[PDB]
Design a binder for this molecule. Structure first.
Ligand SMILES: CC(C)(COP(=O)(O)OP(=O)(O)OC[C@H]1O[C@@H](n2cnc3c(N)ncnc32)[C@H](O)[C@@H]1OP(=O)(O)O)[C@@H](O)C(=O)NCCC(=O)NCCS
Ligand SMILES: CC(C)(COP(=O)(O)OP(=O)(O)OC[C@H]1O[C@@H](n2cnc3c(N)ncnc32)[C@H](O)[C@@H]1OP(=O)(O)O)[C@@H](O)C(=O)NCCC(=O)NCCS
Ligand SMILES: CC(C)(COP(=O)(O)OP(=O)(O)OC[C@H]1O[C@@H](n2cnc3c(N)ncnc32)[C@H](O)[C@@H]1OP(=O)(O)O)[C@@H](O)C(=O)NCCC(=O)NCCS
Ligand SMILES: CC(C)S[C@@H]1O[C@H](CO)[C@H](O)[C@H](O)[C@H]1O
Ligand SMILES: CC(C)S[C@@H]1O[C@H](CO)[C@H](O)[C@H](O)[C@H]1O
Ligand SMILES: CC(C)S[C@@H]1O[C@H](CO)[C@H](O)[C@H](O)[C@H]1O
Ligand SMILES: CC(C)S[C@@H]1O[C@H](CO)[C@H](O)[C@H](O)[C@H]1O
Ligand SMILES: CC(C)S[C@@H]1O[C@H](CO)[C@H](O)[C@H](O)[C@H]1O
Ligand SMILES: CC(C)S[C@@H]1O[C@H](CO)[C@H](O)[C@H](O)[C@H]1O
Lengths: 201, 201, 201
């Protein structure tokens, strides 16, 4: 009701069957289908495919296929990135991942949400809001990060949580919905798992 | 016990290694393997493949691969259906989806379940109860819909919820387990997301 | 530090880019890639592939592709095993599954975890603790079993739960996080689902 890409940028409802958006996705799903079917030994092909797939990729990135996204060109990753099986990034808009981020299996990231009232989405209306994942963050298995969310630096996201609100840095958050359960302190510098202490050398 | 398929229709426990069921499952996993490995540019092949896979398909359906099901023939879908990545439907029995239904990535629908008592499932005994999804329904990411569940028209299922009980129409529901959190009213006709209003034209 | 494999067996922090671990993973993803890309009709190639993939496999095993794992060799499985779509086992160390175990679609098992304090994982430091799954257990859809977890015999794990603590045998557990909701008694020997009783013949 004004150019479509102009509304995406302002957070207004839109649809994406025009302005070359439908082809930007085809170019994208085409590079993804090549990465998902690539033989595990095709390490070079893979290492280079992920450079083409994402808009920005820092050095030392590794993504265990398969990966799924809408357009790959809206995803910006930092250094030493590591993602496990089935990462899904619905990136109809900006998705920014910081340095040293670790992603567990089956994680879903989405900047897109639809209007709750069935009347506002008769034609698949949608809204998009940037997701920002800070540095040295660890997202557990089966996590879901919602639109417009920001995970503060160094934080950890419990497996299975649905993140719907900004998450502050240096905390351990979890739950449905996701809540900060505690702050990461010095006790965590010694106790890495349950009752096991890192008898440092 | 009486014809296995007869038992399926009655809601009795049963095993599916007979009466041609194992081959009906082969015919379907065959079509599904062709859909999931199809190249993104094979638009015509996909469109016609989804007409073959499911029992009934309304016009304007679109399923983003991959898709996973037991048999394809027990799934009935209405108009303008849209499913995102990895939709899984365990349809050992009828699964019915209405019109204008929207499915987020990684959703699981299952008519089938097993008896909790280990002595009752020694031989993979199971039960199947039809799932009915009303018109204009939006199911969020990572949701799981259990057997016999009925989602009412215009309702919205929040990401990550586990639906074990019917959801009335016109509501926003969520949680583990799912519960109605509020009714969708006219405020949702103006405010589509958080604090952003549809300054309607 | 100490030989890396020696640390794994001890429950000490480690990394896995040495001692031939990277190649044990390649031999693994290769067999896996073959299994996930096989035609639903290549029943024999599949049957024989799972015997190659996993360390130990009992008779009458079935795994609906796709399956995902770190190394195949660390997973041991009993008799009559059944895993639906997208089972994921992050077995950087041992994973033992008993007899007659049934697994729903989209289940994630991980023996590995990372230190909570970002300073302890600069180089992808990780820890591994075996996961033991008792006999005649039934795991629901979208379940995540964390490191060092033991599921007791004859137990049931509701769909969508995040298991972080051992589960006693003969119970029905569920939730985020998981919790014993009740013990499985003789009532379950009669009522298999909600209000449907097995009118025993
Ligand atoms: C975050 C994590 C590492 C541990 O957090 P922690 O502070 O050291 O754990 P704690 O036991 O002290 O947590 C405290 C409470 O929160 C609960 N909790 C922990 N993780 C939770 C989760 N993901 N969801 C919900 N509740 C959770 C605990 O069960 C515990 O319950 P209680 O208060 O009744 O006793 C672990 O929970 C986790 O989820 N890790 C992700 C593993 C994964 O996905 N790995 C994939 C491969 S990298
Ligand atoms: C349903 C949804 C659109 C928003 O519902 P809403 O009524 O407008 O949201 P509200 O903030 O008013 O919800 C009220 C409360 O419920 C909680 N809540 C919202 N969604 C929840 C969910 N999925 N699970 C659990 N709790 C949830 C909120 O955190 C809030 O907490 P509070 O009571 O402590 O303040 C959003 O939560 C959602 O999950 N969308 C799905 C997105 C998705 O999966 N997209 C994939 C691509 S389409
Ligand atoms: C475990 C299961 C079979 C039923 O357990 P049950 O004891 O017979 O069920 P109940 O209704 O008596 O459960 C009691 C309570 O726990 C809740 N509950 C049940 N399953 C739950 C789950 N997975 N997560 C959270 N809460 C759950 C119920 O909603 C109910 O709520 P209430 O106390 O407010 O009334 C079912 O919940 C389930 O999740 N099955 C898995 C199905 C699946 O994944 N199938 C895939 C193909 S095999
Ligand atoms: C026809 C629409 C549902 S569009 C569809 O919605 C998806 C989320 O549901 C993603 O945002 C896709 O990129 C978008 O094209
Ligand atoms: C190896 C057998 C369990 S048979 C096998 O089971 C599958 C479901 O698990 C499908 O039904 C196949 O069609 C059937 O041949
Ligand atoms: C059936 C049409 C909506 S087209 C379909 O829509 C998808 C997004 O929903 C993708 O853009 C596909 O590339 C496009 O062909
Ligand atoms: C041998 C059985 C576990 S059968 C198996 O159970 C699955 C659910 O667990 C699905 O219902 C399959 O379609 C069914 O064949
Ligand atoms: C790019 C490297 C981290 S290597 C890469 O790491 C993977 C796990 O992340 C697997 O171990 C591969 O087999 C290995 O070659
Ligand atoms: C570089 C590491 C993140 S290693 C990486 O971590 C994964 C879990 O996050 C799995 O354990 C892989 O097998 C392991 O190589």
């Amino acid at each position: 009701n004004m150019p479509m890409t102009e509304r995406i940028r302002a957070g207004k409802l839109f649809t994406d069957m025009c302005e070359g958006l439908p082809e930007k996705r085809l170019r994208g799903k085409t590079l993804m289908y090549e990465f998902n079917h690539s033989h595990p030994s095709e390490v070079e092909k893979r290492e280079s495919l992920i450079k083409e797939m994402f808009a920005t990729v820092g050095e030392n990135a590794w993504v265990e296929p398969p990966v799924y996204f809408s357009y790959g060109s809206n995803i910006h990753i930092g250094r030493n990135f590591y993602a496990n099986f089935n990462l899904t990034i619905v990136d109809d808009y900006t998705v920014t991942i910081g340095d040293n981020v670790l992603i567990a299996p089956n994680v879903t990231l989405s900047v897109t949400g639809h209007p709750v009232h069935h009347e506002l989405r008769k034609n698949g209306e949608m809204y998009s809001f940037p997701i920002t994942i800070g540095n040295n963050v660890w997202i557990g298995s089966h996590v879901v990060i919602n639109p417009g969310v920001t995970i503060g630096d160094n934080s950890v996201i419990g497996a299975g949580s649905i993140v719907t609100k900004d998450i502050p840095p240096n905390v351990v958050a979890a739950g449905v919905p996701c809540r900060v359960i505690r702050e990461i302190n010095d006790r965590d510098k010694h106790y890495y798992f349950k009752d096991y202490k890192v008898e440092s050398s």
